[PDB]
Design a protein around this ligand. Structure first.
Ligand SMILES: *[C@@H]1O[C@H](CO)[C@@H](O[C@@H]2O[C@H](CO)[C@@H](O[C@@H]3O[C@H](CO[C@H]4O[C@H](CO[C@H]5O[C@H](CO)[C@@H](O)[C@H](O)[C@@H]5O)[C@@H](O)[C@H](O[C@H]5O[C@H](CO)[C@@H](O)[C@H](O)[C@@H]5O[C@H]5O[C@H](CO)[C@@H](O)[C@H](O)[C@@H]5O)[C@@H]4O)[C@@H](O)[C@H](O)[C@@H]3O)[C@H](O)[C@H]2NC(C)=O)[C@H](O)[C@H]1NC(C)=O
Ligand SMILES: CC(C)[C@@H](NC(=O)c1cc(C(F)(F)F)ccc1F)C(=O)N1CCC2(CC1)C(=O)N(C)C(=O)N2c1ccc2n[nH]cc2c1
Ligand SMILES: *[C@@H]1O[C@H](CO)[C@@H](O)[C@H](O)[C@H]1NC(C)=O
Ligand SMILES: [Ca+2]
Ligand SMILES: [Ca+2]
Ligand SMILES: [Cl-]
Ligand SMILES: [Cl-]
Ligand SMILES: [Cl-]
Ligand SMILES: [Cl-]
Ligand SMILES: [Cl-]
Ligand SMILES: [Cl-]
Ligand SMILES: [Cl-]
Ligand SMILES: [Cl-]
Ligand SMILES: [Cl-]
Ligand SMILES: [Cl-]
Ligand SMILES: [Cl-]
Ligand SMILES: [Cl-]
Ligand SMILES: [Mg+2]
Ligand SMILES: [Mg+2]
Ligand SMILES: [Zn+2]
Ligand SMILES: [Zn+2]
Length: 792
């Protein structure tokens, strides 16, 4: 019932009628909300005639001498009426500590969020956006910030607020179907108002739970931007018991203009100017209230924007017979499901097959969601359809063909695509002065916002401490996790006679019985384990195994290494496997027969072959090559996957060593059968080599590290490290790689670059912790481990 009034409660922070930020969206405003709270008379700027006016309640904002006390001046009031300078016109001045008024307990945070602000728009600079440019140059900025997939508004805004991947927070798209609710979420309508959609703990809640008052972050679209700023500014003059410490402004710009005209249309200047004007109003307003050297300002975008036109559309009807029986979420991604339930005609395998490699230059690729690059983190939610289409940048996928084309831009693509990257600036007392920082992922910001407000963050996907280098003052000191399982160091115990593994090798020429020091540490750790042993962060049993060319941590539970570490120097050579050794597998005399793989299992498994974690190709001598054929270096591999793995080991490792002045390589298996991005417990493992307890990995990883200063070799690096990593799907076919019938030099590297990963992604998937013994600080190492080599 709307017969109630908004008198003296406009934009309060509180059946009965509403007067708040979102009442328009919920259709619940009092009758006089428009009249009393959305006042527009005389615009947003004081004029010289209006200075020292008698107060009129009709006006949008005021120019009377009481306004500064009442906190409702137009933002340019001191400039126009009291001869002051605009904030932008002032020189850049370091803020060495927070200069807040009496009774401020902590510096406030204002988040200024923009929609579809591509990173490259910052290259326009002060000619177009002078306020933004001062914030960028005076404060802390990165060249770009990486959004989450899909690169759409709601998943990203809510990711920014929570620190969570969309699969965890539940906003997996602007449109979603939950098959358990049997309901569809959209941007339009009331379904989105149901609490059941919105998981995680957003910042405003984290703050409120810990006694830190929050302003409402989102705004009904009809509230003009100037009024949003004025409201925030009014809230900042409230008494201590009401005044929030965290605030957000949101703008829908420059998204729509991007859609209509494209990211490089000349029409983009006007929206970028209008955004900067609003920033200017904020900064001037802060300055009037003596808060310009008190508040932290974050300027952040949700996602970027790409050139897309109508003529660049693929249609499912060119690939599939019956597009009337499926539902497609289309555009810059595709999600496919059955339109109706209990349709026995629906055949997901046949749909994917018909969508796989049907023409050269096909502008989308189908995937089962568990097979998508792990770096996307886009599977562990029942609202993500099993069938997913990754669409090529600049293209759309639609169901069927059915005038002028009205769009020239769109977004939603793979979050590593350059055009999708967006903006980050941090300005104010807690941010660093005139500091450039490397690109980072939007998931990391929630931890930072929590640090800026003295809050304990809720569990999230950030790596707390990885952005300590953004801040002048760090409240959070990260601590390395405790090692859970200590390594065993088994020495030489067993006779070759003790083993009955069904393996054979022509190895009687070896001097193992003669060699008293066989497999002692010697020089192995120094040369092959450059950053300390990985810590095993779960309860298990494993053995550290030394060899001439490599070191491994061999799990007696999975019957294979969790990691294998080795260094390849710039001038390392490749040697082939001699004919008499092609099928050589040798028992490991340190490891019990009962905790070893057996060769009969591979022989009986007609689908499964094996490979090696340390490649025999990189052996330092013919003698040393025999260590690479140990049963404890063996892992189960599909023949299809061996094409990939052999090329990587034989060709690419040496290439990388050559290019990077040596590399250190750590490789191992991953088990993620339930596609949650987390190391599987034994119960979750769903495939074994036939008749055995040798589990089959879902993925194989490698972490390839060298010196950032490539003039120093990898094993003698004084300074920062350079890392690139991958998580390759362990698949029984190469259907993902459309050119896989060709030589591996035509497709394997492309596959690997698509499956690039963060060291942190591997840590979650293995419950290992890398880079524990280095010359670098632990926060530097956390930065290193969050790095993603994108290949853009
Ligand atoms: C990225 O970070 C995430 C957060 O750390 C990681 O996700 C977390 O993973 C762990 C380990 O698997 C899960 O732990 C199990 O939790 C079970 C209880 O879950 C229920 O309660 C959770 C806690 O609830 C309280 O606290 C939060 C504050 O953090 C408040 O917001 C709550 O109101 C409450 O006071 C709750 O967070 C959890 O949330 C999920 O489920 C609801 C539906 O009930 C969804 O609305 C929501 O979006 C979350 O769904 C996600 O997680 C579930 C798994 O729980 C998935 O199936 C689903 O597909 C979706 O991803 C829920 O209500 C407990 O019984 C078990 O013994 C474990 O302790 C966490 O639940 C999970 N949290 C979240 C938010 O996802 C994630 O692994 C990590 N990713 C990577 C790659 O590292
Ligand atoms: C709108 C949504 C993305 C979310 N915003 C942000 O993540 C957000 C994040 C930042 C950033 F700093 F992190 F970048 C800056 C600004 C922001 F806004 C958000 O505010 N809420 C969650 C949805 C919410 C409200 C609160 C909710 O909880 N429940 C039950 C609803 O029903 N909600 C809706 C959802 C949509 C609405 N349209 N109009 C009214 C609506 C109300
Ligand atoms: C697959 O395409 C073939 C034609 O190449 C067609 O006969 C068959 O019906 C299609 N199946 C599906 C599920 O679209
Ligand atoms: Ca798992
Ligand atoms: Ca293929
Ligand atoms: Cl509205
Ligand atoms: Cl303070
Ligand atoms: Cl949908
Ligand atoms: Cl069908
Ligand atoms: Cl859910
Ligand atoms: Cl530490
Ligand atoms: Cl022999
Ligand atoms: Cl154990
Ligand atoms: Cl080296
Ligand atoms: Cl030999
Ligand atoms: Cl093979
Ligand atoms: Cl350098
Ligand atoms: Mg043999
Ligand atoms: Mg076999
Ligand atoms: Zn957006
Ligand atoms: Zn858009």
């Amino acid at each position: 019932n709307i017969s109630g009034s908004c008198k003296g409660r406009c934009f309060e922070l509180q059946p009965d009628c509403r007067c708040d930020n979102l009442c328009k969206s919920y259709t619940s405003c009092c009758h006089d909300f428009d009249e009393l709270c959305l006042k527009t008379a005389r615009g947003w700027e004081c004029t010289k005639d209006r200075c020292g006016e008698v107060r009129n309640e009709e006006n949008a904002c005021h120019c009377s001498e009481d306004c500064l006390a009442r906190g409702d001046c137009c933002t340019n009031y001191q400039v126009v009426c009291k001869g002051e300078s605009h904030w932008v016109d002032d020189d850049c001045e370091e803020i060495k500590a927070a200069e807040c008024p009496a009774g401020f307990v902590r510096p406030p945070l204002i988040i200024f969020s923009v929609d579809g602000f591509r990173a490259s728009y910052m290259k326009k600079g002060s000619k177009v956006m002078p306020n933004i440019e001062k914030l960028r140059s005076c404060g802390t900025h990165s060249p770009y910030m990486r959004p989450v997939y899909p690169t759409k508004t709601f998943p990203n805004l809510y990711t920014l607020a929570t620190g969570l991947y969309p699969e965890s927070h539940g906003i997996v798209g602007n449109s979603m179907y939950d098959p358990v609710f049997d309901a569809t979420f959209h941007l339009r309508g009331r379904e989105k108002f149901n609490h059941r959609w919105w998981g995680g703990q957003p910042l405003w809640i984290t703050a409120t739970k810990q006694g830190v008052k929050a302003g409402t972050f989102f705004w009904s679209v009809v509230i003009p931007h100037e009024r949003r700023i004025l409201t925030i500014l009014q809230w900042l003059t409230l008494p201590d018991h009401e005044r929030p410490s965290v605030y957000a402004f949101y703008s829908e710009q420059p998204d729509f203009s991007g859609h209509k005209y494209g990211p490089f249309g000349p029409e983009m200047t006007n929206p970028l100017r209008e955004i900067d004007k609003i920033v200017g109003q904020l900064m001037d307003g802060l300055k009037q209230l003596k808060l310009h050297r008190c508040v932290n300002v974050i300027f952040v975008g949700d996602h970027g924007m790409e050139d897309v036109t109508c003529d660049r559309t693929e249609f499912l009807s060119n690939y599939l017979t019956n597009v009337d029986d499926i539902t497609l979420v289309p555009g810059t991604l595709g999600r496919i499901r059955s339109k109706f339930s209990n349709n026995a005609k629906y055949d997901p395998k046949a749909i994917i097959a018909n969508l796989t490699c049907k023409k050269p230059d096909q502008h989308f690729k189908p995937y089962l969601k568990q097979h998508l690059p792990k770096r996307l983190h886009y599977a562990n939610n029942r609202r993500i359809e099993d069938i997913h289409l990754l669409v090529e940048r600049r293209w759309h996928v639609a169901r069927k063909p059915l005038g002028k084309c009205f769009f020239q831009g769109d977004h939603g693509f793979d979050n590593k695509v350059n055009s999708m990257q967006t903006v980050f600036v941090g300005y104010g007392p807690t941010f660093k002065y005139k500091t450039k920082v490397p690109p980072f992922e939007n998931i990391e910001l929630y931890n930072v916002m929590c640090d800026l407000l003295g809050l304990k963050p809720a569990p999230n996907n950030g790596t707390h401490g990885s952005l300590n280098h953004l801040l002048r003052t760090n409240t959070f000191r990260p601590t390395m996790p405790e090692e859970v399982t200590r390594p065993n160091y088994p020495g030489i115990m067993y006779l070759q006679s003790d083993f009955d593994l069904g393996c054979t090798c022509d190895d009687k020429n070896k001097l193992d019985e003669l060699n008293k020091r066989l497999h002692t540490k010697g020089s192995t750790e120094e040369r092959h384990l450059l950053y300390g042993r990985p810590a095993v962060l779960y309860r298990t049993r494993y053995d550290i195994l030394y060899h001439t060319d490599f070191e491994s941590g061999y799990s007696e539970i999975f019957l294979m290494p969790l990691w294998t570490s080795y260094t390849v120097s710039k001038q390392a050579e490749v040697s082939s496997v001699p004919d008499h050794l092609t099928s050589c597998v040798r028992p490991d005399v340190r490891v019990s027969p009962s905790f070893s793989q057996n060769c009969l299992a591979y022989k009986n498994d007609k689908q499964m072959s094996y490979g090696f974690l340390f490649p025999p190709y990189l052996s330092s001598s013919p003698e040393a090559k025999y260590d690479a054929f140990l049963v404890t270096n063996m892992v189960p591999m599909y023949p299809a996957f061996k094409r990939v793995w052999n090329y990587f080991q034989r060709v690419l490792v040496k290439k990388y060593a050559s290019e990077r002045n040596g590399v250190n390589v750590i490789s191992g298996p991953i088990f993620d059968y339930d596609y949650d991005g987390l190391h599987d417990t034994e119960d979750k493992i769903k495939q074994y080599v036939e008749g055995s307890s040798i589990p089959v990995p879902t993925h194989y990883y490698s972490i390839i590290t060298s010196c950032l200063d490539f003039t120093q070799p990898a094993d003698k690096c004084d300074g920062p490290l350079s890392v690139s990593s991958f998580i390759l799907p362990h698949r029984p076919d190469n259907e993902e790689s459309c050119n896989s019938s060709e030589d591996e030099s035509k497709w394997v590297e492309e596959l690997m670059k698509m499956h690039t990963a963060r060291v942190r992604d591997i840590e979650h998937l293995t419950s290992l912790d890398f880079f524990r013994k280095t010359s670098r600080s632990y926060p530097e190492i956390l930065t290193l481990k969050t790095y993603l080599h994108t290949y853009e």
